[PDB]
Amino acid sequence: ATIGRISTGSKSLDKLLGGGIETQAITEVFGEFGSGKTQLAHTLAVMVQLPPEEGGLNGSVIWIDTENTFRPERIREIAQNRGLDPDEVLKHIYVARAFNSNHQMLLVQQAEDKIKELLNTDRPVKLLIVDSLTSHFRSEYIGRGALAERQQKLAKHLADLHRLANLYDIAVFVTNQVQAHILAHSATLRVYLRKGKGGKRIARLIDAPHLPEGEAVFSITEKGIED
């Protein structure tokens, strides 16, 4: 299947990404608390529902929320300010809260059932969010021996997510809170996000020498994100 691309709402970030985030890929955004990772997730969960000529994929959303940070009111705001019906946009976002990392892993299997259910509808799943990908793994796998064990479990979880992305033509979007680099990562594309002044945010592609080497700049607004 040919890949698809979901606009982020920022022309600058879209150019950095070659048009938007890709299906059949895992895009990881990482950065400090408050950098805007979850704002980008909320924005994508609306943008994906737009028709293709407007930068969406007419798609539904699966959202695995590990920090109780999904906000339907934020979806509503973004949708209304983009000309969309907030209640209809919310209808096509299917959210589960992950209690711990083992539940988070099982939820990926449950996600496949929802993906299959919607595959032949007019709004197949096109976006799968895991926010936060790493928070439960960080709290549970800690101390001597944990680096190897945590990395193995996280790699297996990411492999399961890669399979859904690739088998069902879905863009997987995951968030990871960092601080202040030595660990392996298996996402397709890694985007470092940081906060500038007020509502301004700066994005850079990490370890992607074949792709744009500049930086995108965008603002958090009532439309989600915009230039």
Binding site: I62, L90, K91, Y94, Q110
Partner: peptide, 4 residues
């Protein structure tokens, strides 16, 4: 999962 549950619809929002």
């Amino acid at each position: 999962f549950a619809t929002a």
